Amino acid sequence: AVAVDLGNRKLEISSGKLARFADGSAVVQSGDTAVMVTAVSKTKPSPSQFMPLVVDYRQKAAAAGRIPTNIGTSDKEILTSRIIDRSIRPLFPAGYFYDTQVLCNLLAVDGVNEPDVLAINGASVALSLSDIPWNGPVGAVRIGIIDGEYVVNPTRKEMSSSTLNLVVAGAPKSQIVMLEASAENILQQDFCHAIKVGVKYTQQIIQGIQQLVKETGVTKRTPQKLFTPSPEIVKYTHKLAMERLYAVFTDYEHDKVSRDEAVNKIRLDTEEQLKEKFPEADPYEIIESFNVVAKEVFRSIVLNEYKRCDGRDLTSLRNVSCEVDMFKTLHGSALFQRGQTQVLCTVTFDSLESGIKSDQVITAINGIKDKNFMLHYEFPPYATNEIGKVTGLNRRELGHGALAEKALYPVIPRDFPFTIRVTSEVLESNGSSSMASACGGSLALMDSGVPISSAVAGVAIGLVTKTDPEKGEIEDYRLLTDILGIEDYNGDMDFKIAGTNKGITALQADIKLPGIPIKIVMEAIQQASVAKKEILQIMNKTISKPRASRKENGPVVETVQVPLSKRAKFVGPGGYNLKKLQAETGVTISQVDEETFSVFAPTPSAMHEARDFITEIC
Amino acid sequence: AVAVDLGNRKLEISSGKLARFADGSAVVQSGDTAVMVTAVSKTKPSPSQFMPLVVDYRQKAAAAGRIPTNYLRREIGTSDKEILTSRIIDRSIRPLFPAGYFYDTQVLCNLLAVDGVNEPDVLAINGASVALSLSDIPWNGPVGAVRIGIIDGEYVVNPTRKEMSSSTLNLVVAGAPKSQIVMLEASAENILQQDFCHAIKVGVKYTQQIIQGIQQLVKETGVTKRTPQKLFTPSPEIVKYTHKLAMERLYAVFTDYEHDKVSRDEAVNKIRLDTEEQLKEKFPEADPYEIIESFNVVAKEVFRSIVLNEYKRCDGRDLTSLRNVSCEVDMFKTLHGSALFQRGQTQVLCTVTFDSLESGIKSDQVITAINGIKDKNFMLHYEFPPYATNEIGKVNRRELGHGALAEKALYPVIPRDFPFTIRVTSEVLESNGSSSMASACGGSLALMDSGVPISSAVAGVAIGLVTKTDPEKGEIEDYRLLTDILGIEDYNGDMDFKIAGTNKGITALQADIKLPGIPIKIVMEAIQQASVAKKEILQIMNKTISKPRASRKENGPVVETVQVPLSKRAKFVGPGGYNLKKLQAETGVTISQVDEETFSVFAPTPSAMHEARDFITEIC
Amino acid sequence: AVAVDLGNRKLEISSGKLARFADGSAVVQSGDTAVMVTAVSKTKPSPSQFMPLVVDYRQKAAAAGRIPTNYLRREIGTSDKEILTSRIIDRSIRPLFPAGYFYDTQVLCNLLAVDGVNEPDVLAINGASVALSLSDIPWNGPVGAVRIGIIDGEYVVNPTRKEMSSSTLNLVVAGAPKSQIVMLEASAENILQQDFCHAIKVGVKYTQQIIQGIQQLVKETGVTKRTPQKLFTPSPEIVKYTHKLAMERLYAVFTDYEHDKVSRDEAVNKIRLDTEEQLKEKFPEADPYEIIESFNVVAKEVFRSIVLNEYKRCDGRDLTSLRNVSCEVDMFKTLHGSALFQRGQTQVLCTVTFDSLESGIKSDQVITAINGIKDKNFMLHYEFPPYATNEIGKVTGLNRRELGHGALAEKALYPVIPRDFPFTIRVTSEVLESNGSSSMASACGGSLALMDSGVPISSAVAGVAIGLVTKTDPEKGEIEDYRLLTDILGIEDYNGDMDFKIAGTNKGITALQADIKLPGIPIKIVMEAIQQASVAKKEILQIMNKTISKPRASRKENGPVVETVQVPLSKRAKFVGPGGYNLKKLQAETGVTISQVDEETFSVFAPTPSAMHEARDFITEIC
RNA sequence: AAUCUA
Ligand SMILES: [Mg+2]
Ligand SMILES: [Mg+2]
């Protein structure tokens, strides 16, 4: 057991008592909250030609106050699993194509110490003490700002009064592997200092975990094969396809489909030559060698020539155009276009009672939104000309919706008369769809008449690094503004950051490298601030201020007087008449007093239909 | 952009603005309702040896687009109304795909906006036609879809929501070029056959106007169709070789009138397992699947040649004769109503269960709204267990579609203001075709056996079709309409024309046309032919039972209200209704408070009422 | 159309009327309750290398067939009672299928009618037997199934619903011809062993009469069995050659008492890899599965021969010795109650949480809550995470295994749970380590956690599993010798003949589930399996009593607290908000449950006293 | 999916 001190917090880490059959197990305890994290990795190679890592963070009695539920994973559990997955996936060795599952069990929760941060550290310790190949321990802390003071691992009470909710995962040598933040439109300088404080605290956790690894003997397994392309067949692919790929990536009038088809034309014209040259080569190895050669050729152009595949410099945006009031019956609407990415954002007002539901146990599972504000994000298969199932929601769609929701959350007004639901549908996808959902969402919010404090613009910052194979240190790098899909795919990170013209509201740094220096992170934040200014200026031309009032076809809430003698007929047997009227019409009726009822009509026409029934009944 | 005028209604078609990445995309707008339909088809052939076409119609709100909470909940992802609309769109566009187009195709419908006036389901069908027409996906001529209603004796094209609630007909017609009919799906309030037939002719006329507008939009756009990598149809030289190997043996099998479903299928499979192995030797390089489909083509042609040339079915009937129909009722004492309907080798078990009126409404508004209350307090659950075909399967879109059709058939004769919620359960114990239509006949018997005072008995039948078509002109030379088709005649036929009604009208219709459209003359004669069969079936059913029972069974449910004083309300109801909720789960009764002093109690059985009564008395 | 008389009950059995397309069909009727059971078996062999038998018992209504649920089946899914009934039917008919029958088989039960008096679950087992007997599916002799209850000290066959609610024993017996018990499943209210044993003897006598009636129906129908395309059993000459290679190596592994679960399995797999290559070159044309199953047969025979010949288990103990048992309580402060039970290499984490009495009522009370309400407000939730076996698996929802094991452990602890407890008792048993008996360890750990939580259970409950290794005549098929094993490991359950799980207090039996893999076993073997487990259970209760012998005098300080706060009538509208909006908002944001109990009284339930502070401030500020 | 906690 090792105790790590973090200011006024203490992190108790232990292993060797529970779940000893697993490849790796660890118990991380803070206060009275204990999380057991387990890592299991299969020994046989996976049929899939990639890393089949899955993280399942499960909560027992998932509610505020620990109400024991006792079928579906909660959205909070899904988001926590994605944060853990992003913290540990970069540190896995390349070619580790083995099925791996990390499971988090909430042994105890005291309602004071948040178990989500403990689960990330537990995943690090379980992997560190296991035989699973994994490069270096990571440390995860949460940084908040309470009354201008930075606090490490704030309690539940402190988090409720914090202007920042930032989670930092750090690697050895003060590297950063994961950033996930949501701020109440705080200054960039305050945001930058919180990352500096967080990275310092993760180093203390890392050296504590390293002490635990030193005490208990850890022998790493030897995988039967690491599925990385052979260097001698990678460099032969370079000879065949470098010139053709170079012309394609300097062909500045390509679009998304044309560039992809041109690359695939070279791939089909080179993969067959690779097969004859190396008959014994793995069929997947042939595929990955072309991906390796294409990726490095793509990045070499950016590093050497400071020019991108579509002919713009490292700091300029794509073509941005937007419009509002697309359709008459929508309460609010906006079509935001950025390059070849198109998002349709719709604002629908709802009754405040639609935020709560029946099944109060289920209601506490997903909670109640503080501002009665939610964002539903959809990524239809036709956005990328693909076939896919539309039932349910993906993990990626849930995560993208949460990021866009917390980007717009700081500017959403308090105590709005209606529940605000924003539906962002990605009609066309070429990268930064979630950030486009924030810009289009704010445009649609202003079009619907919601008096938001400021317009919110999001942007994605890419990164291309030259890393020496001798030590793994970064010597040169380029930061790209408003990256395309191919730049995210061939890049090192997807630094999605949103905010108003005077602050930052959300951040999600999806770093594919085993860690980046804090210097790069600071420069990416500054670079994104300038790009955010340009996007906001374009957005303000379409609409700069919220409309003076909501659309005339919007919802209306009015009270109806029902006498105590006639109320039996009004509600019927067990509320049958009220529920029947709420099904044939969208009107929601909720009793307020013994002689009055509150009627919410989604449209003025629905109000007329309901009013006819109320008079006829009474 | 092209505008099509359909009487007093206007249709707006546009493309090139939204979802430019999809193979095809279109926005269809009527009034303030706009629907975007996209069509994506893969380039590589699908591993499955058939057409993998899936239509997903999605709604962003419920109750005429007035429930914004609907698509917040990914749970309860799809409703029955969405499934039925997806099946309608699928039936309208599936027959127009080229034969052998084994490519994964998905058609997705997004409701951009709905005004609560114009119905988006018909616009979705037209949007699917435009998206496919403008795309590079190989697809035949444009399909126009309209809805025809009868309001105050007048035929209305694309009636609004208000007009639909007052119309005696809800008919959806999909038309191909040259006034062909691709899909028919109607629910009628027991209207006359002549009135029904006129609406089909009116609808076909209106669909041609839509096809004209879509054709102009296609002309303006530079639409170029892709060349598929391979169309998976058997080679003509292989089909012709299979013909001389198995035509005589298949002919003897289909002229043997002593075969049942299993014996005929086994005899056909015996020839298949004898000819396919010989096909491999003659064509070593042939695609293995091509061999399976070659025998299917030969068997289908031999099967149809007998009906056309000899006017005789495979079981010895003529074109108009029905199968043996036997009925039974009151088999089980505890069931409120029951009926066992047998038609040939098709056996359907129908059960009527009476429930409380409040049982039809869920505990939350959102789920209640998305799956709205039924027009009457009546629903039909349709089950197709795997053992009905001696198969193994998990315990469905097809069962939902069949149940909706059987519910549509029986809905017009269901009485109004019935004290209980009528729930009809149809279980296909044995399947040999027209199981859904047998569910309508058996359901009528079970409703009469349970004591439900239906206005008239309802019988349904399926009409087959066997055509000889010109290989060059594509025109129908001669055709045979078949009465009460078997399963094999559906499989080898051109359409499955399910139509139900009383002795004096038509209540439901669903034409599953597998041809690229059929002439309106064939449809009119199929309706007339089904009228003759419907009368004969109703005559047999009347022998088993001709009128509803004078009263419900003595074991049936009963409602009665008990008095609870205000002082005893706290003890009786309990903490937050806990005591009431415990009772309604133990004894099976349902207690609903109707006023301050009295509670209404519904008990499924008189014994269940006895159990709840004794427990209630000791508390009070 | 054959009627079987069982005392004052009748079993009407018929066929040839409904669902004639199925390979087998039968209608079994008792009183006014009728059940149709169908059996469909494919003719083409399954691509899998085992037996794909699935039983789906489906109901069309809940609460004795009062509230219909078939229409909502798409949304409500399969109820817990249906899953448990399917497992009982599966256990009754699975052992009688011939070895090597690798063909997809589905047995479907359709409840034609229920009168609320005769339970259809027993008729479904008999209907499965008749449907298989009259079908062409290769199946062994008919199986009769009865339920035995003890009402007022007398034994009742197939008790009604009214009688079952007054019975101290809910025992279901499935019997084979010649009085061979094939399935046992029971839940007793801490009854004596002598009374329990007599009920089994009575039940087997009644199942013989049903078998006689089914045999009469089969004879008059004229049933002809199909000939399977192939029975996938290893060739006798292939097995013999495998026994010439792996016999000595496997014998050394199983006589090496220093092994644990992982090392022993790794040692066996090392021999498996060595032998399979020699088998492949010796029999190149052999089925690749046949090579695999040949080693399994040889390894099973070597493993069992040591127990029979030498009376010693693979870990060195004797037939009656228990593995090491360690117990802990109060491992976490915030848990209302917790325990850590270890038995060899089987570790179970048991947690007790108290909720309000209204947490046992679902959302759709009229229809969803009808799927089940706990009698004593007590339930056990059993989880088997994939890392207990060091495996990877899907981890949302419960499979049939976890529902069955949780039901068994819940029934073991149910008799000792007190009555009129102020809170809803919820026990969660998570298997952290698995080496053969986790469901029984959930009963022991659950008893410890209940005492640690402060619940005054009548007595401690201990569960044990009894294995069985038999020597069977190749020609006659009669058992000539047998050994009963106490506290079996996973390897002994896998290579054994039965998984006899029984639990109870020091004075009686509370639960039983006999997972017999043989096609029936003599009643005397079952008789002394109960007796042997009585000795084993006594020793386990001695170890558990050392850790904790009596429940704690009071519940933990951080436990739930419930009391009522008065809300004035003039401001009740503000307190509840629009349509109870404020109450639901407070419940989601704090966790407290507020339920109106009078015209001015609201009962507040708080999971923790700290959360009650938050709620009390909220009520104070919102008046 | 279903056996299978080897
Ligand atoms: Mg077992
Ligand atoms: Mg077992």
CSV table of C-alpha atoms in Angstrom, one decimal, chain C residues 146-159 163-164 166-172 199 202:
chain,number,residue,atom,x,y,z
C,146,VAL,CA,-44.6,-32.9,-9.6
C,147,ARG,CA,-44.6,-30.3,-6.9
C,148,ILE,CA,-44.7,-31.4,-3.3
C,149,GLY,CA,-45.8,-29.0,-0.5
C,150,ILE,CA,-46.2,-29.5,3.2
C,151,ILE,CA,-49.5,-27.9,4.4
C,152,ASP,CA,-50.4,-28.6,8.0
C,153,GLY,CA,-48.0,-31.4,8.2
C,154,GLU,CA,-49.2,-33.4,5.2
C,155,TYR,CA,-47.7,-33.9,1.8
C,156,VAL,CA,-49.7,-32.5,-1.1
C,157,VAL,CA,-49.0,-33.3,-4.8
C,158,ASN,CA,-49.2,-30.3,-7.2
C,159,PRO,CA,-50.6,-27.9,-4.7
C,163,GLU,CA,-52.1,-24.1,-0.8
C,164,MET,CA,-48.7,-23.0,-1.9
C,166,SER,CA,-49.6,-21.8,3.2
C,167,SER,CA,-46.9,-24.4,2.5
C,168,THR,CA,-43.6,-24.7,4.3
C,169,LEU,CA,-42.0,-26.5,1.4
C,170,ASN,CA,-41.9,-25.7,-2.3
C,171,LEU,CA,-40.2,-28.7,-3.8
C,172,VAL,CA,-40.2,-29.7,-7.5
C,199,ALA,CA,-41.1,-35.3,0.6
C,202,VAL,CA,-43.2,-39.1,-2.1
